[PDB]
Structures are given as structure tokens and as C-alpha cells.
Design a protein around this nucleic acid. Structure first.
Ligand SMILES: [Mg+2]
Length: 47
RNA sequence: GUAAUGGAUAUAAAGCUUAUGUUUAUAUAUAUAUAUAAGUAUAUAAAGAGACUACUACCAAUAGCUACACU
């Protein structure tokens, strides 16, 4: 049984695990993305 | 209001696709022999010359003109 491609990232495409580029504001590094399939279906049944 | 030709704020990454250099021996055996030694040319001439076209010359064919001085 494989995994849905939208759920995970290919393990072999990741690298060191830390970010090599500098950021001016650490607050801009945060953003909440949706991962609930049920919540995604609540939008299609509307639109 | 002013600034950006490598702007700005985020995002991803890792044994080398750098506009840069120097070097380049066969055979045999467990030193001897041979004599420059990585290999390569589906790349590279113009002292002069050929062909085609054009220009400048020379030349006077073709064409036009001249007969009571030709027939
Ligand atoms: Mg004539």
C-alpha cells in the first residue's frame, strides 16, 4: 500500500535539515497549511 | 520623498558543468634493451592562380544617318 503524494515529501529530496539562507524576521517563517482531507472536501462541496 | 541593472521579502540545497594554469615512455624481469616519449586532424594557406558576375579601358561589329560626288 503506497502513500498519497500530497501527504509526505520524498525522503531523498531533503538534505541537511537546516536552512542555509538568512532571514530578516523569524516571524515570517511561520505559516499554517491545511492537511485535513475532511476540511478540503468541505470546500469543494461549497464551490 | 528618495533608492534598485548582483532590487526586495520568503523558499529549496551539499564530493564540484569555475570565461584559469602546469605536466603527459614503451618492452622485459625481479636492473637491462630501444632512443623524446599520451594520442589525434570528418581542422587549418594565398607568393600567385581558376571560374562566374560587375566596373574601367581598348576596339568598331550591329544599328541610325549622308547620293545628281555611286549604280
Ligand atoms: Mg554601318
Amino acid at each position: 500500500q503506497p502513500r498519497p503524494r500530497w501527504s509526505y515529501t520524498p525522503e531523498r529530496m531533503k538534505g541537511p535539515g537546516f536552512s542555509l539562507n538568512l532571514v530578516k524576521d523569524p516571524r515570517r517563517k511561520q505559516w499554517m497549511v491545511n492537511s485535513d482531507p475532511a476540511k478540503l472536501d468541505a470546500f469543494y462541496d461549497a464551490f
